[PDB]
A paper describes a structure:
Here we present structural snapshots of Mycobacterium tuberculosis (Mtb) enolase in apo, PEP-bound and two 2PG-bound forms as it catalyzes the conversion of PEP to 2PG.
Tautomerization resonance is accelerated on acidification of the carboxyl group of 2PG which is accomplished through its lone-pair-mediated coordination with both the Mg2+ ions and the transfer of a proton from His154 onto the nearest oxygen linked to the phosphate moiety. To find out if the exact reverse of this reaction occurs during the conversion of PEP to 2PG, we systematically mutated each of the residues Ser42, Asp241, Glu163, Glu204 and Lys335 to alanine, compared their activity with wild type MtEno, and elucidated the structures of three of them [Figs. 4(a) and 4(b)]. Notably, the K335A mutation disrupts the nucleophilic (proton) substitution, the E204A mutation defuncts enolation capacity, D241A should make the MgA 2+ coordination in the active site highly improbable and S42A should absolve the MgB 2+ coordination. We analyzed the solvent accessibility in the protein structure based on tunnels and channels buried in the core of the protein by employing CAVER. The water-accessibility channel tunnel of the MtEno S42A–2PG co-crystal structure was similar to that of MtEno Wt-2PG [Figs. 4(d) and 4(e)], corroborating our annotation of the substrate being 2PG. On the other hand, MgB 2+ was absent, possibly owing to the role of Ser42 in MgB 2+ coordination. However, conversion of PEP to 2PG even in its absence indicated that MgB 2+ may be non-obligatory for the reverse reaction. Moreover, the activity of MtEno–S42A is considerably reduced (∼5% of MtEno WT enzyme) but not completely abolished unlike other mutant enzymes which were non-functional [Fig. 4(b)]. Based on these results, it is plausible that, while MgB 2+ aids in the tautomerization, the presence of MgA 2+ makes its presence partially redundant.
Numbering used by the authors:
A (entry chain A), B (entry chain A), C (entry chain A), D (entry chain A): 1 to 423
């Protein structure tokens, strides 16, 4: 039987070189699964507490504290439970911690176990992770949202918008879809060389040049698309993570490209681009708690584009429900480590999906070699994934895993294609 | 490995005493699963072709024809395939048949194999059917929609509306929820005795008295609710399957309670009841192809009540998509045998769920001892099921299986309760 | 038994976003191993032929050609052989190709199989890859040579020397050793910020600022070491890959920092630094075929520093033997993909090790999520590894795997420390 | 799993008829391995303490004392440990003893367990001992150094030099190599008969005639080579173990063939022979602690011949390191029982091999039916073995095991041939 028999945990380095939690689970039937926990550069206020060691080591960013929680407290608590009772294991961890924000054991320890338990469950079931999580109907390969020009907090550059990504919605398959993104990325490299701009990479592996403004970046991407013999829009669409939390002052407003601006001021600018450019998606265009601004933007342009809530929802059913009720955004960015457990994440997906909202499975600035979200994207049938550029193997590894799932699925597999966005 | 090794099929009797298809699947690892196929009394035009033998036997309702298709054609075609590649097995069956409406091998043969393969997959995975189909997050026990007064085609009575059902939305758990329905049903029995009306059962095990009109029935149910020491609405809500296809004349209109009436005429009457009674759901209030009428009813009262499409969608993504586009209804009645495969069914659920529509897993007038839909309701997290009265074990068996799933889930389990209907 | 039963191969993306070969091997005992093949940005002339597709796809850098070789030719050839007869499998592949430079099937296909077969062997033996390859005595954790400032071909910058790396020789353990490098890297980030220089990353995840000269870079690294509260030399030493092939003109000489210079000219400059800075290692200081220059440099400063042959030996026993005979260099850079097989690599290690030469296991500019070389470094007991910065998970993943091996080894484990370099 | 479950030990007779330690190890997975411990006639001062019983039995040479140590102390200490964690098991034994020279439990008990554990590890891994110890690259069959004329302490004759051996360096394979030695040995038998000299065997199974001097012996061997239709040098080379410890007086000098002589006196004589005869190797030409003499001999003739350290290094990394530093000898004679553990032995090999020194795996005057060193020679890829004459099955058994390894390896196998000695 798949009965949890051993829970070990160790400290490893994420893609930025910062420590994080890796968890290992053994079942009485000799199953061995391993899950590693990502970390965002700038984390939203309402995220689950990341338990850091503090002090001298790794500039206080150590997670030995979180590792001992797993060995000392969680292991003893879940050992004896059944690995395929995810909700019961997840509820035990949540109850063991006993805090709203998972501040006792840490979301990074809690999730470490949540994910490792899920992988062990699927190995023991002799099912690939996407098939076990999403059932036998898991088959929709997602549109890669590939962040090829990096700004905001993932770059030490003076670019305001955090992510500029390409969406090969026109591709007939994932294998072609991934080729297109790759081929556009390499094109952009040459474009940036031609214009004498920087090709040093940011955190998610996009190029980090000191472009003048938002227009200028999108123009360079469009060039790159065309240079790669693809048509902007129909073949390859555009997307943003504005991340307007990281350039919003509590109460005051948004300090954005010279002029400190209102949500309505901003809302006009975003509408402008929908005109100029082939944008299918805009994420965190306004601040985490600027609830008024989002409703107006959503009311204004929601018919015309996909609006993705990241820091406003922090993958939280509580925050998401308020959103749905107030008609804030049409899509949820899904980040396991924001909420802290797999079941809390899927509850969030389920709420969004039942509320007619789309979902986009997301990585963090600090990723590991873990490919968990690759399977999660297909399992939940989101048809959209944001796991960074076609550069840096903490991003690429997910795309490689998506290739494998597509292979495994054979004729069963369908690429979400342009069906991901009605508008 | 879970590789299909043997496919046998035989003819059995459904709950009406009519033959139907039962399928058995063996995997190379010695897994043995069995699935039986239901049949509706009056089937919608756009349903999958049920392959009947014709001739003298069982008044032409034999399925020996369909049984040989399984032995002779399907067995040889799927043997060697992997049981947990549901979509690949389902696609092979669909391609082998090679017709739009599954008229070659018959939906009843095709589905027989589709479901048996799915059950074998789950046994081999050592997972309960709901866990394998819906993943580890399957936990939402559905609200039983219990049809305790039978009219229309399930009764040889002069009652116009086909189904009158009770919805114990107020119950804290499924185990209590099922008790309430049972206790209300037995109360209604005594009420009908008191009023000297009939307690002979219809097809779905509801009482089939010759009540004057629609009002009169709902009044008797309300009595019964109150007599059982429960509060109508808050504890126990009301629901209908109008089945207005079975009393609509192509082009003319709806011959309903004396007066042949327009969709707008009808629409006024339905709105009337929402006022008089605590209705959470109304199903097939207008005809299968009366596309104009549904839009007006949906526009009119859709804010005020759940509108369920049965014969208008026949569990067909094609028909459902047109509905969503034309804003026809807010919920899909899910019937595996209308569409013909498990994967086609789940595609339909997925379309509805992504379009912000609710889903209600449904039985047929002709049911078997099969409890498949009990698991399917929890797997898809619909939170609503219509599997008939708390009488006749072709209905009860599903409720017994729902009790078992609730047990298995323990603290994980949550009863959909009043969360199934916002309004 | 561990008898090769299935060989599958697919095309994936390396860390630059370029396609490469991934191979999967199944044994009759149901073992499943996967190995992925790296690729260097600028490859030495004498490396094994990388079989590229050419044409439009991935700017001609596709490897579908190589994938079919595996499926069509290699699979049929090795299936039936014993996975733990590495030399026999490797010899079969070499003979099947039948060319000096592996130009028929491609080193990238050949090696794909060589490595996958080795991993399957170790799984079947129930041994970690390092234990199976290096026997029960494999225990020496290597000194991480961490390339934290990137120039040459891994950067679109005007820096002449390709790699600037830090060597935490003073650390008591790998776990501390990796912390030091990480902590120094993050320090350098802050230093570069302070000096207003670029922190956009190069191919191996080092910072790619447009530093004036070689001195200036080494000075910034030393700052960073000191800023991290470690002592340059005793705690953290310095190392270079000059990669003088990529700035040498056939017959003419080396175009290096303004002045086109002789091997003797260069040799004086390198000796200068040994004075100024705490350098333990200098790699490819002169050109691949500049055999005369290396002897003089080796004669001149070989007593004073470790000289590492990369492109001069291309992991080739043939090239290495000439070197040993002519007393060219004191160390071999080991790259599996230069030579094409695991056994050819180990022959090369064995020649070097028996000739009193040290060995440094190396990655490529294009790496995958594969951690194979992490195990290989410990198995061969080199005590030195170059797998890039503590940034980008195609580098970090190896360091994470080295942490795991150190854990597994417990008290058995010894960190090579300052014992890696006598001088 | 390969977890040590039982350690039994018993007293057996070596090839001289003296008791020694035999150890048996059982793993929880029902693996059964047996290792027997050799003993040298005259042991170097710096060897590990051989724990002898003393008293009446076997003239005090009993090892019941050592057997009880295994049963009473070591068994309980290592039971529960993992057999393939050699270094951890070896370190436990070393720590349990807790003395520099293994004088508490005895090297003969300690090693008994060290070797038995290693064999059990390899059985459980389902790998031949050479493959498990040396990894998949173990393939180099060693040159047999066959001691066919015995003097010194292995003979009750008046011959000064201890070993006169033949080296079939010219052979194309081990199977031919062993034939040549055998055929030369039988030839020497006939030569000795012709000259009316003795053919009674010494301890290692070489002929023990009372030859006049060192020249006279080498002349008889050369005759024998030629009589066997092989060419001295190119086909069959010559080698000595001078064993100058057993004819050196502390402080005074070496009493050798009439004249008590200086290290420089001796050094001239050895140089003389290199001229007269085809010698590839000379072992313990000077005394164990005569550190000055070895440096001069090594400086003098080290370019011209292989110098093997036996009693000077006693297979001790400590003693070997001093040697390497002082440039004493170019090769290490490897004897497991001198150092006391397999891991301490391999550390010694590793030091020598990384210092550019060759290694020769050696037996003892007192050998058992054990063939362990046959595998060890191939695992460490020494390409040289000294396991005595082609007579007496305590020698021959090793050659028979080398034949089997060569068979197993097939085309993988390479005979070290004349590649063992550059000079
Ligand atoms: O803004 C976001 O969506 C994420 C990137 O996936 O940012 P961070 O990981 O820094 O929280
Ligand atoms: O109208 C319906 O929903 C069904 C009852 O489940 O009717 P029939 O089975 O007769 O098609
Ligand atoms: O020069 C080197 O050693 C390598 C980096 O490991 O370079 P490339 O991978 O580009 O050949
Ligand atoms: O001198 C030696 O090398 C050995 C023989 O292998 O001698 P003894 O076994 O007597 O120590
Ligand atoms: Mg954001
Ligand atoms: Mg109906
Ligand atoms: Mg180089
Ligand atoms: Mg000796």
């Amino acid at each position: 039987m798949p009965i949890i028999e051993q829970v070990r945990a160790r400290e490893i380095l994420d893609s930025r070189g910062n420590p994080t939690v890796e968890v290992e689970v053994a079942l009485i039937d000799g199953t061995f699964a391993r899950a590693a926990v990502p970390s965002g550069a700038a984390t939203g206020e309402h995220e689950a507490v990341e338990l850091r060691d503090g002090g001298d080591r790794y500039g206080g960013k150590g997670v030995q504290k979180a590792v001992q929680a797993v060995l000392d407290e969680i292991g003893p608590a879940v050992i004896g439970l059944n690995a395929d009772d995810q909700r019961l294991v997840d509820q035990a961890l949540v109850d063991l911690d006993g805090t709203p924000d998972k501040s006792r054991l840490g979301g990074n320890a809690i999730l470490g176990v949540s994910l490792a338990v899920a992988k062990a469950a699927a190995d023991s079931a002799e099912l690939p992770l996407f098939r076990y999580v999403g059932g036998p109907n898991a088959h929709i390969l997602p549109v890669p949202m590939m962040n090829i020009l990096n700004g905001g907090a993932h770059a030490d550059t003076a670019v305001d918008i955090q992510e500029f990504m390409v969406a090969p919605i026109g591709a007939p398959s994932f294998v072609e879809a991934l080729r297109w993104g790759a081929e556009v990325y390499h094109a952009l490299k040459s474009v940036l060389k031609k214009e004498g701009l920087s090709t040093g990479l940011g955190d998610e592996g996009g190029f980090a040049p000191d472009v003048a403004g938002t227009t200028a970046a999108l123009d360079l991407i469009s060039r790159a698309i065309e240079s790669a013999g693809l048509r902007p829009g129909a073949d390859v669409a555009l997307a943003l993570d504005a991340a307007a939390t990281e350039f919003f002052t509590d109460g005051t407003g948004y300090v954005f490209e010279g002029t400190t601006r209102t949500a309505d001021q901003m809302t006009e600018f975003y509408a402008g681009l929908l005109g100029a450019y082939p944008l299918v998606s805009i994420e965190d265009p306004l601040s985490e708690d600027d609830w008024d601004g989002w409703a107006a933007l959503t009311a204004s342009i929601g018919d015309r584009v996909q609006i993705v809530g990241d820091d406003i929802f922090v993958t939280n059913p509580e925050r998401l429900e308020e959103g749905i009720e107030r008609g804030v955004a049409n899509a949820l960015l899904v980040k396991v480590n924001q909420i802290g457990t797999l079941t809390e994440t899927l509850d969030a997906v389920t709420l969004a999906h039942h509320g007619g909202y789309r979902t986009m499975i997301s990585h963090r600035s600090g990723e590991t070699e873990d490919t968990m979200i690759a399977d999660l994207a297909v399992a939940i049938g989101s048809g959209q994934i944001k796991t960074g550029a076609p550069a840096r193997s903490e991003r690429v590894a997910k795309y490689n895993q998506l290739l494998r799932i597509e292979e495994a699925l054979g004729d069963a597999a369908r690429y979400a294609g342009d069906l991901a966005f009605p508008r």
